[PDB]
Amino acid sequence: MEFFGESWKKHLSGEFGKPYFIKLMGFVAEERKHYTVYPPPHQVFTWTQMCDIKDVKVVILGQDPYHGPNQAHGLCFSVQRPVPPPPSLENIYKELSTDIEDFVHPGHGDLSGWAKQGVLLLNAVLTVRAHQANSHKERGWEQFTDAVVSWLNQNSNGLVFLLWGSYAQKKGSAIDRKRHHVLQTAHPSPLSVYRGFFGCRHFSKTNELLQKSGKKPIDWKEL
DNA sequence: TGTATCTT
DNA sequence: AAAGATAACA
Ligand SMILES: O=c1cc[nH]c(=O)[nH]1
């Protein structure tokens, strides 16, 4: 057992020996020697430990991890107990409450329950320097996460990609819009939420598009 | 202070 | 690229 889930390591292995990835890991390690980097080393790839790669039905793509202490744990927008849901997640829960009739605030912020159902909780960038949002962008993470999205685009059919925010939206051109469903809206952060996130209804829409492809819907309350 | 996105 | 401007709030 390790950082990468079995199936994900098998299909993403070709990236490890590539110059951009070797250099990206070197940079992250060098940042960790001078600064505090989120999430810790063992939780950078938690998004690979929740379900098998070919069991992925939905993909929620965010910007980068949370930049405050004990927040980011490798699943986009998630926080493990007893850490309270950060501003972005409180907004996600509010949208979920107006979108899904049965959804109520779960009293915690751990999104592992969605991830176990086949919802890939990925960020365009997988690490961040403490207190500095998007500090690790354009260092190599985008090419790695492009490889993840590309693999899913090529080897699967009828996936629902939820691209939240400008940076997450850059991956739109890596997805075949006729073979997969791409839903795009503003980032749930208070600084952008009013630009389309509130009222986007991505959760009910995902479940409707899944049932049209003959797949089982996501129980958003299973947390 | 702190939690995006468009403009210059 | 990076910083200013804009923008919404317990
Ligand atoms: O994981 C996270 C947290 C905040 N914002 C994101 O885009 N992703």
mmCIF file of C-alpha atoms (C1' of nucleotides) and ligand atoms in Angstrom:
data_model
loop_
_atom_site.group_PDB
_atom_site.id
_atom_site.type_symbol
_atom_site.label_atom_id
_atom_site.label_comp_id
_atom_site.label_asym_id
_atom_site.label_seq_id
_atom_site.Cartn_x
_atom_site.Cartn_y
_atom_site.Cartn_z
ATOM 1 C CA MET A 1 0.000 0.000 0.000
ATOM 2 C CA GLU A 2 1.169 3.537 -0.831
ATOM 3 C CA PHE A 3 0.439 7.116 -2.091
ATOM 4 C CA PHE A 4 -0.858 6.080 -5.502
ATOM 5 C CA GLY A 5 -3.822 3.734 -5.749
ATOM 6 C CA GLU A 6 -3.087 0.495 -7.659
ATOM 7 C CA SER A 7 -5.030 1.203 -10.874
ATOM 8 C CA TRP A 8 -3.957 4.851 -11.090
ATOM 9 C CA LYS A 9 -0.233 4.048 -10.796
ATOM 10 C CA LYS A 10 -0.646 1.471 -13.611
ATOM 11 C CA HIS A 11 -2.167 4.031 -16.018
ATOM 12 C CA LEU A 12 -0.206 7.146 -14.980
ATOM 13 C CA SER A 13 3.257 5.482 -14.769
ATOM 14 C CA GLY A 14 4.386 6.856 -18.127
ATOM 15 C CA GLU A 15 4.520 10.333 -16.576
ATOM 16 C CA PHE A 16 7.061 9.460 -13.838
ATOM 17 C CA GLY A 17 10.088 9.228 -16.115
ATOM 18 C CA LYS A 18 9.204 12.443 -17.977
ATOM 19 C CA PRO A 19 11.431 15.560 -17.464
ATOM 20 C CA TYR A 20 8.526 17.828 -16.395
ATOM 21 C CA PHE A 21 7.416 15.443 -13.614
ATOM 22 C CA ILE A 22 10.943 14.696 -12.329
ATOM 23 C CA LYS A 23 11.500 18.461 -12.130
ATOM 24 C CA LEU A 24 8.096 19.181 -10.572
ATOM 25 C CA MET A 25 8.764 16.753 -7.681
ATOM 26 C CA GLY A 26 12.196 18.305 -7.173
ATOM 27 C CA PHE A 27 10.600 21.752 -6.889
ATOM 28 C CA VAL A 28 7.944 20.551 -4.402
ATOM 29 C CA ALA A 29 10.669 18.894 -2.275
ATOM 30 C CA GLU A 30 12.736 22.115 -2.341
ATOM 31 C CA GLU A 31 9.683 24.164 -1.302
ATOM 32 C CA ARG A 32 9.131 21.770 1.663
ATOM 33 C CA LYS A 33 12.667 22.490 2.940
ATOM 34 C CA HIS A 34 12.058 26.258 3.173
ATOM 35 C CA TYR A 35 8.270 26.532 3.539
ATOM 36 C CA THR A 36 5.225 24.581 4.708
ATOM 37 C CA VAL A 37 3.489 22.985 1.704
ATOM 38 C CA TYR A 38 -0.083 21.694 1.603
ATOM 39 C CA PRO A 39 -1.208 18.867 1.600
ATOM 40 C CA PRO A 40 1.452 16.756 3.447
ATOM 41 C CA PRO A 41 3.449 14.313 1.164
ATOM 42 C CA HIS A 42 1.229 11.294 1.919
ATOM 43 C CA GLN A 43 -1.962 13.138 1.016
ATOM 44 C CA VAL A 44 -1.011 14.742 -2.324
ATOM 45 C CA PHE A 45 -2.481 11.769 -4.178
ATOM 46 C CA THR A 46 -5.500 10.864 -1.975
ATOM 47 C CA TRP A 47 -7.679 11.352 -5.051
ATOM 48 C CA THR A 48 -6.198 8.051 -6.324
ATOM 49 C CA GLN A 49 -7.006 6.070 -3.157
ATOM 50 C CA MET A 50 -10.801 6.280 -3.094
ATOM 51 C CA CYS A 51 -11.928 4.152 -6.048
ATOM 52 C CA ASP A 52 -10.518 2.329 -9.099
ATOM 53 C CA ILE A 53 -9.732 4.512 -12.164
ATOM 54 C CA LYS A 54 -12.275 2.832 -14.467
ATOM 55 C CA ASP A 55 -14.991 3.248 -11.816
ATOM 56 C CA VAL A 56 -14.742 7.049 -12.143
ATOM 57 C CA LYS A 57 -18.091 8.436 -13.303
ATOM 58 C CA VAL A 58 -17.828 12.131 -12.372
ATOM 59 C CA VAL A 59 -14.856 14.528 -12.157
ATOM 60 C CA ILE A 60 -14.949 17.668 -10.000
ATOM 61 C CA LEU A 61 -12.004 19.874 -10.968
ATOM 62 C CA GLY A 62 -10.989 22.730 -8.691
ATOM 63 C CA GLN A 63 -8.095 25.223 -8.764
ATOM 64 C CA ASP A 64 -5.486 24.222 -6.153
ATOM 65 C CA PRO A 65 -5.484 22.842 -2.533
ATOM 66 C CA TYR A 66 -6.536 24.795 0.576
ATOM 67 C CA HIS A 67 -3.691 27.028 1.838
ATOM 68 C CA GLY A 68 -4.424 27.086 5.573
ATOM 69 C CA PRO A 69 -3.174 24.600 8.264
ATOM 70 C CA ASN A 70 -4.767 21.106 8.519
ATOM 71 C CA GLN A 71 -7.185 21.790 5.649
ATOM 72 C CA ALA A 72 -6.089 20.217 2.333
ATOM 73 C CA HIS A 73 -5.899 16.425 2.279
ATOM 74 C CA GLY A 74 -5.773 15.546 -1.422
ATOM 75 C CA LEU A 75 -9.459 15.662 -2.270
ATOM 76 C CA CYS A 76 -10.606 18.953 -3.788
ATOM 77 C CA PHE A 77 -12.761 21.071 -1.440
ATOM 78 C CA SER A 78 -12.581 18.473 1.356
ATOM 79 C CA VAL A 79 -11.448 18.725 4.999
ATOM 80 C CA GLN A 80 -11.088 15.829 7.466
ATOM 81 C CA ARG A 81 -12.697 15.917 10.940
ATOM 82 C CA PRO A 82 -12.559 17.995 13.241
ATOM 83 C CA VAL A 83 -11.597 20.784 10.790
ATOM 84 C CA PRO A 84 -14.708 22.887 9.912
ATOM 85 C CA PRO A 85 -15.815 23.328 6.239
ATOM 86 C CA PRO A 86 -13.870 26.312 4.772
ATOM 87 C CA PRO A 87 -15.776 29.176 3.013
ATOM 88 C CA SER A 88 -15.753 27.405 -0.417
ATOM 89 C CA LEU A 89 -17.284 24.192 0.965
ATOM 90 C CA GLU A 90 -19.969 26.045 2.932
ATOM 91 C CA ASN A 91 -21.006 27.549 -0.414
ATOM 92 C CA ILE A 92 -20.982 24.085 -2.073
ATOM 93 C CA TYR A 93 -23.274 22.807 0.702
ATOM 94 C CA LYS A 94 -25.600 25.806 0.230
ATOM 95 C CA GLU A 95 -25.900 25.110 -3.499
ATOM 96 C CA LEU A 96 -26.437 21.417 -2.766
ATOM 97 C CA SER A 97 -29.264 22.348 -0.365
ATOM 98 C CA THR A 98 -31.134 24.371 -3.023
ATOM 99 C CA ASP A 99 -30.347 21.864 -5.798
ATOM 100 C CA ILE A 100 -30.957 18.504 -4.071
ATOM 101 C CA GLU A 101 -34.190 18.321 -2.032
ATOM 102 C CA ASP A 102 -32.869 15.780 0.515
ATOM 103 C CA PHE A 103 -29.489 17.455 1.134
ATOM 104 C CA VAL A 104 -28.830 19.084 4.504
ATOM 105 C CA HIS A 105 -25.495 20.237 5.987
ATOM 106 C CA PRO A 106 -23.658 17.040 7.177
ATOM 107 C CA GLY A 107 -21.861 18.701 10.115
ATOM 108 C CA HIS A 108 -18.385 17.980 8.704
ATOM 109 C CA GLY A 109 -16.404 18.597 5.529
ATOM 110 C CA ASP A 110 -15.033 15.175 4.572
ATOM 111 C CA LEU A 111 -15.912 14.466 0.929
ATOM 112 C CA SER A 112 -14.535 10.892 0.934
ATOM 113 C CA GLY A 113 -18.108 9.596 0.565
ATOM 114 C CA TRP A 114 -18.454 11.144 -2.910
ATOM 115 C CA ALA A 115 -15.026 9.944 -3.945
ATOM 116 C CA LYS A 116 -15.890 6.325 -3.025
ATOM 117 C CA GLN A 117 -18.880 6.538 -5.424
ATOM 118 C CA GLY A 118 -16.674 7.389 -8.392
ATOM 119 C CA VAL A 119 -16.470 11.177 -8.153
ATOM 120 C CA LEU A 120 -12.826 12.141 -8.832
ATOM 121 C CA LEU A 121 -12.041 15.097 -6.559
ATOM 122 C CA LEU A 122 -9.131 16.647 -8.485
ATOM 123 C CA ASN A 123 -7.456 20.074 -8.511
ATOM 124 C CA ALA A 124 -5.606 21.432 -11.586
ATOM 125 C CA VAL A 125 -2.607 22.027 -9.282
ATOM 126 C CA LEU A 126 -1.900 19.507 -6.496
ATOM 127 C CA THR A 127 0.269 21.416 -3.994
ATOM 128 C CA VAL A 128 0.377 24.958 -2.613
ATOM 129 C CA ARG A 129 2.736 27.034 -0.480
ATOM 130 C CA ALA A 130 1.177 28.058 2.848
ATOM 131 C CA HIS A 131 -1.059 31.173 2.852
ATOM 132 C CA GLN A 132 -0.452 31.804 -0.877
ATOM 133 C CA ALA A 133 -3.277 30.700 -3.218
ATOM 134 C CA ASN A 134 -2.153 29.299 -6.599
ATOM 135 C CA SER A 135 1.548 29.655 -5.657
ATOM 136 C CA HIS A 136 2.470 26.317 -7.271
ATOM 137 C CA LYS A 137 0.722 26.914 -10.603
ATOM 138 C CA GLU A 138 2.599 26.569 -13.940
ATOM 139 C CA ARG A 139 5.322 24.380 -12.396
ATOM 140 C CA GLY A 140 4.336 21.073 -13.993
ATOM 141 C CA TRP A 141 1.159 20.034 -12.141
ATOM 142 C CA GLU A 142 -1.096 21.139 -15.013
ATOM 143 C CA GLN A 143 0.627 18.755 -17.427
ATOM 144 C CA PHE A 144 0.246 15.886 -14.933
ATOM 145 C CA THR A 145 -3.420 16.632 -14.296
ATOM 146 C CA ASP A 146 -3.892 17.029 -18.088
ATOM 147 C CA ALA A 147 -2.602 13.436 -18.382
ATOM 148 C CA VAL A 148 -5.235 12.268 -15.859
ATOM 149 C CA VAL A 149 -8.036 14.069 -17.716
ATOM 150 C CA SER A 150 -6.709 12.832 -21.092
ATOM 151 C CA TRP A 151 -6.637 9.204 -19.919
ATOM 152 C CA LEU A 152 -10.261 9.449 -18.690
ATOM 153 C CA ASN A 153 -11.318 11.211 -21.898
ATOM 154 C CA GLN A 154 -9.800 8.429 -24.060
ATOM 155 C CA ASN A 155 -10.627 5.264 -22.092
ATOM 156 C CA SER A 156 -14.122 6.105 -20.838
ATOM 157 C CA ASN A 157 -17.490 7.132 -22.254
ATOM 158 C CA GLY A 158 -20.199 9.424 -20.881
ATOM 159 C CA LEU A 159 -18.346 11.068 -17.973
ATOM 160 C CA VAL A 160 -19.505 14.286 -16.336
ATOM 161 C CA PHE A 161 -16.747 16.886 -15.848
ATOM 162 C CA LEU A 162 -17.541 19.708 -13.389
ATOM 163 C CA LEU A 163 -14.994 22.501 -14.077
ATOM 164 C CA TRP A 164 -15.131 25.066 -11.255
ATOM 165 C CA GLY A 165 -13.155 28.269 -11.816
ATOM 166 C CA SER A 166 -10.972 29.784 -14.572
ATOM 167 C CA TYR A 167 -7.976 27.527 -13.947
ATOM 168 C CA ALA A 168 -10.055 24.337 -13.869
ATOM 169 C CA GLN A 169 -11.709 25.479 -17.108
ATOM 170 C CA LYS A 170 -8.380 25.405 -19.020
ATOM 171 C CA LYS A 171 -8.832 21.626 -19.270
ATOM 172 C CA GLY A 172 -11.990 22.022 -21.375
ATOM 173 C CA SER A 173 -9.954 21.594 -24.591
ATOM 174 C CA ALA A 174 -8.631 18.217 -23.340
ATOM 175 C CA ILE A 175 -12.162 16.756 -23.250
ATOM 176 C CA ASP A 176 -14.274 15.576 -26.215
ATOM 177 C CA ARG A 177 -17.487 17.593 -25.700
ATOM 178 C CA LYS A 178 -19.548 15.076 -27.714
ATOM 179 C CA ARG A 179 -18.455 11.927 -25.838
ATOM 180 C CA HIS A 180 -18.468 13.426 -22.336
ATOM 181 C CA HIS A 181 -20.560 16.058 -20.550
ATOM 182 C CA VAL A 182 -18.724 19.218 -19.528
ATOM 183 C CA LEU A 183 -20.395 21.550 -17.005
ATOM 184 C CA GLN A 184 -18.618 24.865 -16.309
ATOM 185 C CA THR A 185 -19.245 27.516 -13.614
ATOM 186 C CA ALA A 186 -17.454 29.966 -11.295
ATOM 187 C CA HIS A 187 -15.285 28.847 -8.344
ATOM 188 C CA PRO A 188 -17.314 28.360 -5.086
ATOM 189 C CA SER A 189 -14.999 30.735 -3.131
ATOM 190 C CA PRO A 190 -16.836 33.826 -1.680
ATOM 191 C CA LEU A 191 -14.715 35.930 -4.056
ATOM 192 C CA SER A 192 -16.348 34.309 -7.117
ATOM 193 C CA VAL A 193 -19.448 32.372 -5.995
ATOM 194 C CA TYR A 194 -21.914 35.070 -7.128
ATOM 195 C CA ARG A 195 -20.669 34.758 -10.747
ATOM 196 C CA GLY A 196 -22.634 31.600 -11.521
ATOM 197 C CA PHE A 197 -21.947 28.958 -8.847
ATOM 198 C CA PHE A 198 -25.094 29.812 -6.875
ATOM 199 C CA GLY A 199 -27.856 28.532 -9.153
ATOM 200 C CA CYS A 200 -25.586 26.382 -11.387
ATOM 201 C CA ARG A 201 -27.421 23.203 -10.283
ATOM 202 C CA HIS A 202 -24.453 20.963 -11.219
ATOM 203 C CA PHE A 203 -25.377 18.224 -8.759
ATOM 204 C CA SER A 204 -28.875 17.424 -10.051
ATOM 205 C CA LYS A 205 -27.708 17.865 -13.658
ATOM 206 C CA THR A 206 -24.856 15.376 -13.151
ATOM 207 C CA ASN A 207 -27.342 12.775 -11.867
ATOM 208 C CA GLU A 208 -29.708 13.408 -14.803
ATOM 209 C CA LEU A 209 -26.923 13.053 -17.402
ATOM 210 C CA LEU A 210 -25.685 9.880 -15.659
ATOM 211 C CA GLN A 211 -29.140 8.249 -15.852
ATOM 212 C CA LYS A 212 -29.283 9.129 -19.573
ATOM 213 C CA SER A 213 -26.029 7.194 -20.125
ATOM 214 C CA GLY A 214 -27.474 4.232 -18.195
ATOM 215 C CA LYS A 215 -25.265 4.746 -15.128
ATOM 216 C CA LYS A 216 -26.227 4.868 -11.435
ATOM 217 C CA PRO A 217 -26.644 8.406 -9.958
ATOM 218 C CA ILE A 218 -24.440 9.948 -7.257
ATOM 219 C CA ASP A 219 -25.948 10.089 -3.787
ATOM 220 C CA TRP A 220 -24.638 13.517 -2.727
ATOM 221 C CA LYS A 221 -25.896 12.921 0.828
ATOM 222 C CA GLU A 222 -23.713 9.800 1.239
ATOM 223 C CA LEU A 223 -20.968 11.486 3.297
ATOM 224 C "C1'" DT B 1 -7.517 40.651 7.525
ATOM 225 C "C1'" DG B 2 -9.286 36.847 5.011
ATOM 226 C "C1'" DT B 3 -11.945 33.655 1.494
ATOM 227 C "C1'" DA B 4 -11.627 34.760 -7.662
ATOM 228 C "C1'" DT B 5 -11.683 37.189 -11.921
ATOM 229 C "C1'" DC B 6 -11.182 40.809 -15.128
ATOM 230 C "C1'" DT B 7 -8.213 44.832 -16.524
ATOM 231 C "C1'" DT B 8 -3.934 47.187 -17.489
ATOM 232 C "C1'" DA C 1 4.050 38.227 -15.375
ATOM 233 C "C1'" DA C 2 2.307 40.837 -11.835
ATOM 234 C "C1'" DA C 3 -0.304 44.183 -9.625
ATOM 235 C "C1'" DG C 4 -4.363 47.141 -9.487
ATOM 236 C "C1'" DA C 5 -9.406 47.050 -9.788
ATOM 237 C "C1'" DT C 6 -13.567 44.977 -8.805
ATOM 238 C "C1'" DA C 7 -16.572 42.696 -5.826
ATOM 239 C "C1'" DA C 8 -19.454 40.190 -1.696
ATOM 240 C "C1'" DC C 9 -19.576 39.366 3.350
ATOM 241 C "C1'" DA C 10 -19.814 36.839 8.860
HETATM 242 O O1 LIG D 1 -9.207 21.762 -2.832
HETATM 243 C C1 LIG D 1 -9.515 22.925 -3.096
HETATM 244 C C2 LIG D 1 -9.696 23.972 -2.146
HETATM 245 C C3 LIG D 1 -9.986 25.209 -2.563
HETATM 246 N N1 LIG D 1 -10.115 25.534 -3.887
HETATM 247 C C4 LIG D 1 -9.943 24.582 -4.873
HETATM 248 O O2 LIG D 1 -10.027 24.843 -6.055
HETATM 249 N N2 LIG D 1 -9.658 23.317 -4.417
#
